[PDB]
Amino acid sequence: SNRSLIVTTILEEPYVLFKKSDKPLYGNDRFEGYCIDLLRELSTILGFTYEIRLVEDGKYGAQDDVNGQWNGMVRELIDHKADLAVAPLTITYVREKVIDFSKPFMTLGISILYRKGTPIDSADDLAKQTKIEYGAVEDGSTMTFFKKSKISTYDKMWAFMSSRRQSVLVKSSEEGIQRVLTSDYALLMESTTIEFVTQRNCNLTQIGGLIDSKGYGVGTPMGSPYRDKITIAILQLQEEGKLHMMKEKWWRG
Amino acid sequence: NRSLIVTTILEEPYVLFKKSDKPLYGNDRFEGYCIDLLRELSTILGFTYEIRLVEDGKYGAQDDVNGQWNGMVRELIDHKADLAVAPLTITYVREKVIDFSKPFMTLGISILYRKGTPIDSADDLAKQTKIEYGAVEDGSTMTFFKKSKISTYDKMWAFMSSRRQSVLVKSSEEGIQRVLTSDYALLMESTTIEFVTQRNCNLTQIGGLIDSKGYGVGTPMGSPYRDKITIAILQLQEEGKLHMMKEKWWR
Numbered sequence: 244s245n246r247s248l249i250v251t252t253i254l255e256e257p258y259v260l261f262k263k264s265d266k267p268l269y270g271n272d273r274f275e276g277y278c279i280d281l282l283r284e285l286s287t288i289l290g291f292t293y294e295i296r297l298v299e300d301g302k303y304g305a306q307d308d309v310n311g312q313w314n315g316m317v318r319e320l321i322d323h324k325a326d327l328a329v330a331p332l333t334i335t336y337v338r339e340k341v342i343d344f345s346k347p348f349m350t351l352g353i354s355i356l357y358r359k360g361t362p363i364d365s366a367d368d369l370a371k372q373t374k375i376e377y378g379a380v381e382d383g384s385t386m387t388f389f390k391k392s393k394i395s396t397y398d399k400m401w402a403f404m405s406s407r408r409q410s411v412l413v414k415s416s417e418e419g420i421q422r423v424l425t426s427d428y429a430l431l432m433e434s435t436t437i438e439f440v441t442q443r444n445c446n447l448t449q450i451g452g453l454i455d456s457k458g459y460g461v462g463t464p465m466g467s468p469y470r471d472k473i474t475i476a477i478l479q480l481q482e483e484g485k486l487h488m489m490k491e492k493w494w495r496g
Numbered sequence: 497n498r499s500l501i502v503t504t505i506l507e508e509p510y511v512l513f514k515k516s517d518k519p520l521y522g523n524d525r526f527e528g529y530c531i532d533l534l535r536e537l538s539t540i541l542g543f544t545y546e547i548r549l550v551e552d553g554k555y556g557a558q559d560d561v562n563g564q565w566n567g568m569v570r571e572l573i574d575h576k577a578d579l580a581v582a583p584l585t586i587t588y589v590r591e592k593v594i595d596f597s598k599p600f601m602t603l604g605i606s607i608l609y610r611k612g613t614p615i616d617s618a619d620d621l622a623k624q625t626k627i628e629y630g631a632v633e634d635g636s637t638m639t640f641f642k643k644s645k646i647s648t649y650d651k652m653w654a655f656m657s658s659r660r661q662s663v664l665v666k667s668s669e670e671g672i673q674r675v676l677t678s679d680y681a682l683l684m685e686s687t688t689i690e691f692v693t694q695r696n697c698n699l700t701q702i703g704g705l706i707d708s709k710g711y712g713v714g715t716p717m718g719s720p721y722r723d724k725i726t727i728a729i730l731q732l733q734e735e736g737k738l739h740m741m742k743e744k745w746w747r
């Protein structure tokens with residue numbers, strides 16, 4: 244009741260980072276970022292104290308296809324090792340079956356990162372040609388979406404990416420961003436990342452709108468009383484304009 | 497086992513009467529995006545249902561004097577319906593008294609107005625009086641302005657509440673007609689504006705989204721269906737079916 248909540252999280256720019264500071268920093272104050280700002284607001288609104296812990300396996304949370312066991316922050320919640328996961332944890336069907344998410348504090352989707360000043364305006368324009376290469380970070384959520392879409396355009400896109408995978412799937416986002424900057428290439432990625440990048444790379448832009456729709460939510464264990472309280476607090480923060488301010492604080496270049 | 501009662505409201509392209517030459521029966525009276533959503537949810541979760549239009553014709557807002565809710569929100573509070581499947585906006589005041597699914601569609605408040613004018617933002621509207629503006633009575637857009645501490649929107653509510661018999665309209669239908677026939681701008685959700693402006697080509701959206709929010713399925717507080725419907729929505733989203741439904745109804 245006066246117990247501190249254990250908050251699992253993971254390093255991910257600009258959601259959660261170690262703060263650079265002149266002053267000495269102790270404990271939770273060693274961290275900063277959008278999710279840390281959100282956590283601070285939630286703790287004030289709902290009146291809890293907390294302890295931030297970085298997740299032991301450096302994973303968000305997936306289910307093993309052979310033994311059915313979870314990992315990452317999702318596993319910490321399932322096992323009641325954490326009270327909250329405050330991180331850009333995507334709200335998905337498979338996860339929502341095993342933990343309880345708040346309503347989303349951010350809604351987003353897959354989109355396209357490309358250089359400015361071209362006539363390409365959609366995923367369709369990319370799908371119906373071969374001169375401009377395009378791809379994604381190998382094994383990421385975005386690539387996974389394409390590997391599964393039965394939507395026409397996206398199925399064609401995956402045909403291309405899969406065949407030319409040694410050429411167009413990259414091992415990291417920075418590798419991908421450099422390819423967009425130095426060659427005739429477009430990168431499929433989450434729109435939150437694209438915005439972060441385009442605020443810092445004035446010669447790049449998002450192409451088109453969103454290709455899918457999904458949200459990031461605060462994770463709680465199934466049955467947690469904090470889930471609905473956090474949802475109401477998030478909705479109020481949104482309506483008051485405060486999450487929008489928080490987003491601009493951490494994303495603007 | 498037993499049919500659920502589903503409350504909803506007439507609002508195109510979400511819910512509308514299906515055109516026919518002879519009377520249609522029961523649920524077959526209706527079509528639209530939300531009618532298709534309801535059908536898909538019923539398939540995943542395995543329930544039958546009877547659609548009933550909300551008895552008082554309202555989305556739902558709190559009466560300031562006695563504190564009581566009306567509309568679909570009140571029907572859920574009083575267990576007059578099991579679900580509300582409708583373009584029902586998820587707001588923190590409503591989430592305190594009913595249980596929403598996670599959102600099936602995102603949206604934001606924006607402005608519907610005639611083309612070709614110098615007006616480009618809520619601020620332009622707030623800072624003059626010639627052009628009147630309003631919203632649908634007892635919906636979340638009205639309630640956003642009524643509660644807003646943001647200076648521009650607080651100003652707009654001052655205007656609107658002063659002239660509420662005038663500028664607060666009974667329905668989007670009435671609001672659209674007012675935009676078309678008088679010097680009036682309608683504060684309307686962006687999804688609905690996108691539908692309207694594809695049909696009325698002398699109308700346009702002014703500015704961007706004022707806020708960001710979603711539509712959810714409403715259930716009574718504590719309903720077992722709330723989390724089931726959330727999981728079904730995520731399945732439909734990830735399968736691309738919500739996107740296909742949006743393409744069908746916003747052509």
Ligand SMILES: O=C(O)[C@@H]1C[C@H]2C[C@@H](CN3CC(F)(F)C[C@H]3C(=O)O)CC[C@H]2CN1
Nearest residue numbers: 303331332333380383384385386416432433
């Ligand atoms: O919950 C999750 O699994 C993900 C993890 C993490 C995923 C990144 C994006 N991916 C990182 C990646 F680089 F590995 C590929 C990229 C993508 O798939 O587009 C954005 C912030 C997160 C959002 N939620």
Ligand SMILES: N[C@@H](CCC(=O)O)C(=O)O
Nearest residue numbers: 555583584585635636637
């Ligand atoms: N979707 C709104 C109604 C429309 C509006 O207020 O603009 C609601 O749930 O109240």
Ligand SMILES: [Cl-]
Nearest residue numbers: 244245246247
């Ligand atoms: Cl204690």
Ligand SMILES: [Cl-]
Nearest residue numbers: 345346597598
């Ligand atoms: Cl929820």
Ligand SMILES: [Li+]
Nearest residue numbers: 339340342343
């Ligand atoms: Li869940």
Ligand SMILES: [Li+]
Nearest residue numbers: 591592594595
């Ligand atoms: Li609620």
